[PDB]
Amino acid sequence: DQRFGDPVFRQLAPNVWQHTSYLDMPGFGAVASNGLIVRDGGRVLMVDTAGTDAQTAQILKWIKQEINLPVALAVVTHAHQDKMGGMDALHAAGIATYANALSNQLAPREGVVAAQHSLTFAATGWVEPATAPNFGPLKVFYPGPGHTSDNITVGIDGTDIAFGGCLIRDSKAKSLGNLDEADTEHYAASVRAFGAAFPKASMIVMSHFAPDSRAAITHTARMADKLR
């Protein structure tokens, strides 16, 4: 029988799915965490792990059974358990992993396994193409410090979709979540930069809420303005 801790999948576009897994840090309750699976020709690319290696394995199994194409690579959007909690699974599966250079530097401080490869960014925010080879439709943008110093974002070329990770909250959210590692001065402008980077994206995907309109960007930025 399917159970609560099992990952759930939603098709967002012909070649894109959202995976959601409900994980559980002590002190606090369990929370849902989302990433993406993208079909690019004869291969699959992932954005973020699940919050645990077990749930990540269950995703790779689903991918194998439902898509049956090899996962060529994964890009993980910052060094916290929810996005990088499944690095061991990805590496056991032979998947090439990519993260912000900064994420890889923070990973041992945050108790997560670093990605194999480091992305660097121009002063514009855009990934340097020599660090993101054969990314296909994944367009990686560093919007500046927000949720964390290292948080990155991903646009999906040929689609409606951009992925904001834990940077973005949905249009009904009443909080930005945990701010203990947030850059409260830069958060608002970073959210706006993400918006300006992906102006064609009408479907905003994010870590802890279901996909929303571009009003999630505005709503998140205007909550963040109150922190300055």
Ligand SMILES: O=P(O)(O)c1ccccc1
């Ligand atoms: O994450 P789920 O797709 O199982 C969900 C949960 C409550 C309402 C709608 C969808």
Ligand SMILES: O=P(O)(O)c1ccccc1
């Ligand atoms: O969204 P955060 O990266 O603050 C988080 C959420 C659940 C578990 C660990 C980290």
Ligand SMILES: O=[N+]([O-])c1ccc(O)cc1
């Ligand atoms: O054999 N494995 O790499 C495993 C085994 C169990 C698990 O939950 C995840 C990965």
Ligand SMILES: [Mg+2]
């Ligand atoms: Mg683990």
Ligand SMILES: [Mg+2]
């Ligand atoms: Mg920490």
Ligand SMILES: [Zn+2]
């Ligand atoms: Zn985080």
Ligand SMILES: [Zn+2]
């Ligand atoms: Zn998160």
